[PDB]
Design a protein around this ligand. Structure first.
Ligand SMILES: [Mg+2]
Ligand SMILES: [Mg+2]
Ligand SMILES: [Mg+2]
Ligand SMILES: [Mg+2]
Ligand SMILES: [Mg+2]
Ligand SMILES: [Mg+2]
Ligand SMILES: [Mg+2]
Ligand SMILES: [Mg+2]
Ligand SMILES: [Mg+2]
Ligand SMILES: [Mg+2]
Ligand SMILES: [Mg+2]
Ligand SMILES: [Mg+2]
Ligand SMILES: [Mg+2]
Ligand SMILES: [Mg+2]
Ligand SMILES: [Mg+2]
Ligand SMILES: [Mg+2]
Ligand SMILES: [Mg+2]
Ligand SMILES: [Mg+2]
Ligand SMILES: [Mg+2]
Ligand SMILES: [Mg+2]
Ligand SMILES: [Mg+2]
Ligand SMILES: [Mg+2]
Ligand SMILES: [Mg+2]
Lengths: 87, 110, 141, 361, 55, 106, 122, 42, 246
RNA sequence: UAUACAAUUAUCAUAUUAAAUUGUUAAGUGUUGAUUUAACCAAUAAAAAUAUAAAUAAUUUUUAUUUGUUUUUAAACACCAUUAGGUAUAUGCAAAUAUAAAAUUAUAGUAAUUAUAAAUUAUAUUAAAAAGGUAUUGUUGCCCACCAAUUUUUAUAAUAAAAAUAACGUGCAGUAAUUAAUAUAUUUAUAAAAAUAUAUUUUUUUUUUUU
RNA sequence: UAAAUUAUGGUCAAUUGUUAGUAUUCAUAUUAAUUUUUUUAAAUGUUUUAUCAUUUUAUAAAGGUUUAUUUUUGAAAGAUUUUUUGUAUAAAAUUUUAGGAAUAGUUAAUAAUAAUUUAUAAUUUUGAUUAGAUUGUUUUGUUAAUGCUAUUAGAUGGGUGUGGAAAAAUAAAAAAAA
């Protein structure tokens, strides 16, 4: 188990975040493609943290806040958090 | 010695490996050590430890406003008397006085 | 030789002498002579784990004669109870009674040696008999 | 000019030497870190007295004559004549006992030989090592409990004292052999052991050894930390000499013990038996006590002769008792350590104290 | 070993446990266990004449 | 030896209450229960330790915790001046009597 | 269970202590270093720790380096709950050392450790 | 693996594992060693 | 460093030293192993600072160069002889007249005997190892020079004639060495470790699997049995004889 | 998210029972000139040899002491630079592999691991016979640093550090690999790295029991 | 330095992951939890009394404390016709931070002293004081097991000092003088 990947869950299983950016990043070879990465924000003890996580979710009509869960590893190095649903 | 012999763990091989380090690993870490040392030389690092001061905390003299290499970065704040004395030390270290013991010289020491 | 190292005991290296001399198939071992050490020898010789033993009233050492059967030793394993002298394990009578019991069947196969408040060196079987607790020394079988 | 400066170019393994430069020759420490520049005049005297020569004390001739008057009678008949039978053998019980000539050759054995031979076995002809062994044997003999005693504390302490002086002046001459620095330090440690066992065996001999060879510097407790925890005094516990005193010759034991049933201390039963044990006092304790003894006479004189001043002070005290922090004694007020038992007040509410601990506890 | 105590690695836990180990405790022989090196070579150039009030 | 014996909430796993009486006298706690500051957090300490383990009364002969060598008894023998060792003849730490104990009838 | 409870029957834990006298700078006050015991059940072994106490000796017998018996008592001053019950071993060497006008024990050579480098020459 | 945990050559005799546990914390709680200075369970 | 492997390299070799490091040591200066059966102050042979061994010139007669020399061994084999008892034949007069020198009585046997080891005694490390070089202590090998016997040669006869020494054999009267020897030789140790079958240690015994040895021990009165000792023997004899496995 | 190292043998930086320290010797002129080197250039050339015994074992030196950096060239070799020189080897300072440790990296938050050794690889003068692989249908094999973008953590040193990374441009550092490599030391620098001083084989071996 | 029997006694220790050359407690298992669900809580007006008063009705606000928290019967219980006693405030142990330095209305003696009594004072490297985190010494989970891993909550200075005891300014679920 790798315990430092969970740094921004802060001892919680799931997180609530707000959408900011959505950009694309290329995974580690030999896997080619475009991985969609959402750049999100949330606040804890009046500090505003920018969270960076893998967008696997389904976007419908335009919506703002997501639910973040931690997984195993993914093709893309450096992105620990995954998306459950969008609200 | 003050400085570090190694950087990172240079002896990592399997147990009972009958040498301190393998060739491969030692070459990797020789690379990293090389880069760090080269950085020290070109940026012209200088450290000092003064008597009757906390020793673990070393005044970095290479960042002092007079001896600073960069024209841009704000260097450091060290006492006026002490800093004068440090400048004098660095300056009068440079050249060999006869009767004194010969000590290794370099471009980057100035 | 230094601080982190274990503090050895005549029992510790008594057991390891015997173990190593059993691995090299020797007939005789010269071994440290203290009260509980030659106690341990008399108990092992009772159970027949050892061919014989003698104390010559030599101060340092005395001698043990090992027994082999069917080409390997009579001793599977022999282990000291404590690694240090700074650690002392006490055996409750119920514990020594647990050892004797293999899921409902009475098992005397393995022997455990221990000190008593009475300075006797006993196996766990006599200990359980008279219901006295004792300090652990070593196991052997 | 002002503190030394080490300059370190971090690509280099070690710093450049300091600017004031230090002394060119390293100081020689004793075991505890104290510095000796040279032998002390006493030790110097010991080596100057070893060098030119030693001597057997006529003490030995005397006790030889009183113990074995017959043998001494024989030697007394035979002086100057060559002897084929060594009557003198009782005078020299051990090989080591005869140091006045080389190779442990007793004096009276040289009677019938050439004077050249006599000069060739003389003290002047000894090597330096032989001379050391000579001094050591003489002193060992003066402190020994019997002839063959070696391991006893006094003997050990003396021989180690001598060895130590030798090594010290040796290091004075040729500065770097760190083998012998180490051997000097180890010797000094074993000397420390020997002396601290001595003062609990017989202390006067301990004293006169320290006064003869001038080693008080290795009896000094190393540092305040381990001393404050009483591990300096803890040594003679480990050595097993802690209870060894055998009081009755000194210190009549009647007032050293407390009463179990009464609960009264030793100062109390001493009070009752009309005995006084008190350590000799320095001027501190004397002038403190002599200042305190007189409080009531000074007071009586004050309140007789000068009532108004007194009544002023009293006004202030009496009225003070009503002002102030606490007017009545409760567990809170009567807490002997206020900052300690309430630490939770110290930053915020209570500003008087800046720390929670002013004493052991 | 709970992962929140001490460092993020495991071995940091056992490195701080060696601070509490029974046979490792500080005494008159083993001293300054936690910083040995700040106090090293501290008195080298401090010259102290040892204390003798007896000849 | 199991988990059920870990739970002291059974009265069968727990040293009984009355011991604290036997040490401090009977009905001694009824006093303590009426105390001003109680149970927040602390109550007047309740001493229950199996009476064969009591440090006060018992000694090296009936109590196994006293005859532990390397800290209690080692110091004691060093102090009293008995010869001692790791594995010794006497139950406690000691090969033989000291000089005082041999020369004096107590 | 340690030396102290081995020798004494204590009405209350810590009511008796045996220790050494370390320093007397305070009138009618003897500081005493004492050992007590800690048990680590994980490793099944004991450690000795040490602690200082202020003890009250009226009449000022105690010389530094005495082996003393010490008891719990009435609160005396802010930090003194203990009094010197009996001198087990007096310091004969120290007393004779005082009689000659010298300090009981030589003062420790170095004080507490520092993080500086003191350059003090001659 | 110079950098990593020490492994036993064989297992440990379970019986010995149980014999060394005699003075452990649970047995102590059962003997009553620790003082009860607080309310504890309700 | 680069956090991944740039090279895909799988060696298939599994050297037994790499895997089980509990039982094998590849570090130089640790090669002498774990031997408990030595007489030294450590069970780890390679921390011992006394006798440094010589891997090149040693171990002709003992097998490996690690193992203890023939004369220092504290553990003995079944079919191998154990140490000779030193003397320092007159005392066999009661025995077989032809019986020669007993194999276990030796004139010169030294349990403390320094064997010459090069790395200790001849140490070439501080030199270039040219033919004469290296530092040598001569205190090990007995001097084969003629200087000694010449320099000390005297008209007074030697120590033995002068009978300077006190004591004698350290055990006092010994049947083999000092006094005469009567009865029978036990060459195997069979009578020397036996268990007293009696409270009086009068009768002793040695039991094999299927065999039983009862030995009467009363060397003082010439094996004359008392009433108690005889009534005892009639017990040990029939309790040995009515045993199941004898 | 909690949920059981070893204690018989484990290679990088926390030493510890030890006998050393000190020695004033050698070498130098006849004469007309191609020595050394794979090749250049400066330009007198000969040389510095001796010590064993003895020192007792353990228990409170850890702020103490200690691990190849050293005055004098009017003395050389050697090394570094180049016809104009520098330097030329333990009196200052300098703890430090000989192992007490808990998966790799990383200043202790970065990536998800890393490291490793015996299979396989055609030419070394026997009356043809001994050999290495970071590759893995294997040299047209792999890999190494600087040089752009970006991503991310922070203890911001010419131009911060570290980690992900798949461009462009230099080369050719490494796999006994085109002057063998590895570690420490000191110097040098487009970049791998290179020169020298010590140790050393995870480099391949060449072998006089008085001639 | 001998064996043992008047025979199973003194009441149960028992370990379950389909891996990927090898070295090292580390992904995917079970149990326990958070994810996860309205079958146990609850509303305001306390109450007498001799009248502007006087009797009864004593530890859930916050702050962040690791050498730390300690106490009586004079209230009630409580029984006689009246003067009734003594015992108490003190201590000992256990005390956290990867890379570590000084702390301070300050110690001890005097005494119902001293904002300037006397003294060679006290705490600290056997780890202090500040500073971070944190509600302290019968409570849990896992486990065959010395372990590892939890345990809430409740005592936050004085300033007409009432009261037996400060625990005294919403937040019960304590029958509070028919
Ligand atoms: Mg976490
Ligand atoms: Mg993947
Ligand atoms: Mg380099
Ligand atoms: Mg207090
Ligand atoms: Mg605060
Ligand atoms: Mg448990
Ligand atoms: Mg790999
Ligand atoms: Mg290969
Ligand atoms: Mg280390
Ligand atoms: Mg020079
Ligand atoms: Mg960044
Ligand atoms: Mg960067
Ligand atoms: Mg290349
Ligand atoms: Mg190269
Ligand atoms: Mg190459
Ligand atoms: Mg290299
Ligand atoms: Mg380059
Ligand atoms: Mg290099
Ligand atoms: Mg509250
Ligand atoms: Mg705090
Ligand atoms: Mg406390
Ligand atoms: Mg208190
Ligand atoms: Mg207020």
């Amino acid at each position: 188990l790798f315990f430092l990947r969970m740094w921004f869950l802060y001892g919680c299983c799931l997180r609530f975040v707000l959408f900011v950016l959505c950009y694309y990043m290329s995974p580690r070879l030999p896997s080619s493609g475009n991985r969609r990465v959402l750049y999100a924000v949330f606040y804890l003890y009046n500090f505003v943290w920018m969270l960076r996580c893998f967008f696997c979710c389904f976007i419908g009509l335009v919506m703002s806040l997501f639910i973040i869960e931690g997984g195993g590893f993914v093709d893309l190095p450096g992105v620990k958090y995954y998306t459950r649903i969008v609200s | 010695r003050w400085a570090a012999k190694f950087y990172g763990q240079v002896t990592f091989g399997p147990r009972n490996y009958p040498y301190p380090s393998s060739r491969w690993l030692a070459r990797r870490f020789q690379m990293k050590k090389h880069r760090i040392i080269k950085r020290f030389r070109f940026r012209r690092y200088k450290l000092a430890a003064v008597a009757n001061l906390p020793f673990a905390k070393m005044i970095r003299v290479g960042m002092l406003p007079e001896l600073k290499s960069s024209k841009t970065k704000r260097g450091d704040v060290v006492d006026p008397t002490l800093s004068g004395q440090l400048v004098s030390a660095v300056k009068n270290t440079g050249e060999k006085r006869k009767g004194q013991r010969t000590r290794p010289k370099s471009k980057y020491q100035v | 030789r230094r601080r982190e190292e274990n503090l050895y005991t005549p029992i510790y290296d008594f057991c390891h002498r015997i173990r190593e001399a059993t691995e090299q198939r020797k007939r005789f071992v010269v071994v440290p002579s203290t009260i509980e050490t030659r106690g341990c020898a008399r108990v092992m010789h009772d159970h027949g784990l050892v061919a014989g033993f003698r104390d010559f009233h030599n101060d340092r050492a005395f001698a043990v004669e090992l027994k082999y059967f069917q080409g390997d030793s009579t001793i599977n394993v022999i282990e000291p109870c404590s690694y240090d002298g700074r650690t002392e394990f006490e055996w409750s009578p119920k514990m020594m009674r647990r050892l004797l019991n293999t899921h409902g069947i009475h098992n005397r196969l393995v022997v455990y040696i221990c000190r008593t408040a009475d300075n006797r060196i006993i196996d766990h079987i006599h200990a359980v008999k008279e219901n006295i607790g004792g300090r652990g020394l070593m196991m052997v079988h | 000019e002002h503190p030394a400066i080490w300059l370190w170019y971090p690509w280099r393994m070690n710093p450049e030497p300091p600017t004031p430069h230090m002394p060119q020759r390293r100081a020689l420490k004793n075991v505890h870190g104290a510095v000796f520049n040279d032998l002390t005049p006493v030790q110097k005297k010991r080596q100057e007295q070893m060098l030119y020569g030693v001597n057997i004390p006529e003490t030995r001739q005397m006790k030889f004559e009183e113990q074995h008057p017959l043998l001494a009678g024989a030697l007394r008949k035979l002086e100057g004549q060559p002897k084929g039978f060594p009557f003198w053998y009782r005078k020299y019980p051990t090989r080591r006992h005869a140091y006045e000539y080389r190779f442990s050759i007793p004096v009276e054995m040289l009677d019938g030989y050439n004077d050249d031979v006599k000069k060739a076995l003389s003290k002047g002809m000894m090597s330096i090592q032989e001379k050391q062994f000579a001094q050591e044997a003489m002193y060992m003999e003066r402190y020994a409990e019997h002839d063959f005693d070696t391991t006893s504390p006094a003997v050990l302490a003396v021989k180690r004292a001598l060895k130590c002086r030798v090594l010290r002046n040796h290091l004075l001459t040729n500065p770097h052999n760190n083998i012998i620095k180490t051997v000097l330090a180890n010797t000094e440690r074993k000397l420390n052991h020997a002396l601290r066992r001595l003062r609990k065996v017989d202390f006067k001999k301990y004293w006169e050894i320290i006064r003869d060879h001038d080693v008080q510097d290795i009896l000094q407790p190393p540092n305040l930390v381990t001393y404050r925890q009483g591990s300096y005094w803890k040594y003679d516990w480990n050595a097993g000499l802690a209870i060894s005193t055998n009081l009755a010759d000194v210190m009549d034991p009647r007032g050293l013990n407390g009463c179990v049933e009464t609960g009264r201390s030793r100062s109390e039963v001493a009070r009752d038996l009309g005995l006084s044990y008190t350590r000799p006092l320095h001027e501190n304790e004397k002038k403190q006590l002599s200042h305190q003894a007189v409080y009531y006479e000074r007071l009586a004189k004050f309140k007789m002769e000068q009532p108004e001043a007194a009544r002023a002070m009293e006004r202030e005290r009496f009225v003070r008792k009503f002002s102030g922090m606490f007017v009545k004694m409760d567990i809170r007020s009567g807490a002997p350590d206020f900052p300690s038992t309430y630490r939770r007040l110290l930053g915020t509410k209570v500003v008087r104290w800046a720390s929670k601990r002013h004493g052991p506890n | 070993i709970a992962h929140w105590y001490c460092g993020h690695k495991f071995r940091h836990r056992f490195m701080r446990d060696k601070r509490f180990h029974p046979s490792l405790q500080a005494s008159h022989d083993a001293r300054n266990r936690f910083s040995k090196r700040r106090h090293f070579k501290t008195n080298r150039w401090n010259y102290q004449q040892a204390y003798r009030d007896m000849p | 030896s199991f988990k059920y014996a870990t739970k002291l909430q059974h009265d069968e796993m727990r040293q009984p209450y009355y011991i604290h009486e036997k040490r401090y006298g009977i009905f001694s706690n009824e006093r303590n229960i009426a105390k001003a500051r109680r149970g927040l957090p602390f109550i007047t300490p309740l001493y229950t330790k199996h009476m064969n383990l009591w440090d006060t009364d018992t000694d090296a002969s009936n109590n196994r915790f006293f005859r532990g060598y390397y800290y209690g008894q080692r110091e004691l023998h060093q102090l009293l001046g008995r010869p001692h060792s790791l594995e010794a003849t006497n139950a406690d730490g000691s090969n033989d009597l000291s000089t005082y104990e041999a020369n004096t009838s107590q | 269970y340690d030396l102290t409870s081995l020798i004494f029957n204590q009405p209350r834990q810590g009511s008796d202590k045996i220790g050494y006298v370390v320093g007397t700078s305070m009138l009618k006050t003897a500081v005493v270093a004492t050992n007590h015991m800690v048990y680590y059940p994980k490793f099944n072994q004991r450690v000795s720790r040490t602690k200082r106490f202020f003890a009250h000796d009226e009449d000022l017998a105690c010389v530094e380096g005495d082996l003393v018996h010490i008891k719990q008592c009435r609160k005396i001053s802010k930090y003194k709950h203990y009094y010197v019950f009996s001198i087990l071993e007096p310091n004969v060497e120290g007393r004779e050392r005082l009689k000659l006008g010298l300090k009981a024990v030589p003062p420790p050579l170095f004080g507490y450790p520092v993080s500086r480098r003191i350059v003090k020459l001659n | 693996h110079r950098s990593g945990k020490a492994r036993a050559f064989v297992f440990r005799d379970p019986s010995l594992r149980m014999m060394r546990a005699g003075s452990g914390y649970q047995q102590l709680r059962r003997m009553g060693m620790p003082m009860q200075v607080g309310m504890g369970w309700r | 460093l680069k956090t991944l492997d740039v090279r895909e390299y799988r060696p298939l070799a599994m050297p037994i030293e790499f895997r089980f490091y509990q039982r094998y040591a590849n570090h130089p200066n640790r090669q002498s192993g774990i031997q408990f059966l030595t007489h030294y102050n450590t069970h780890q042979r390679f921390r011992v600072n006394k006798d440094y061994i010589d891997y090149m010139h040693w171990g002709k007669e003992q097998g490996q160069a690690r193992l203890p020399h023939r004369h220092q061994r504290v553990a003995f084999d079944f079919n191998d002889q154990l140490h000779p008892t030193r003397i320092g034949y007159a005392w066999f007069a009661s025995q077989d007249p032809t019986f020669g020198h007993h194999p276990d009585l030796s004139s010169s046997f030294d349990p403390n005997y320094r064997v010459f080891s090069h790395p200790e005694h001849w140490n070439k490390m501080f030199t270039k190892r040219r033919p004469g070089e290296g530092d040598i202590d001569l205190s090990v090998l007995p001097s084969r020079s003629l200087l000694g016997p010449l320099m000390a040669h005297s008209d007074t006869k030697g120590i033995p004639y002068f009978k300077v020494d006190n004591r004698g054999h350290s055990n006092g009267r010994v049947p083999g060495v000092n006094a005469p020897f009567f009865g029978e030789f036990d060459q195997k140790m069979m009578q020397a470790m036996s268990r007293p079958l009696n409270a009086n240690r009068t009768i002793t015994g040695n039991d094999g699997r299927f065999s039983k040895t009862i030995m009467i021990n009363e060397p003082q009165c010439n094996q004359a049995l008392s009433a108690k000792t005889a009534s005892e023997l009639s017990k040990e004899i029939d309790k040995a004889t009515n045993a199941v496995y004898s």
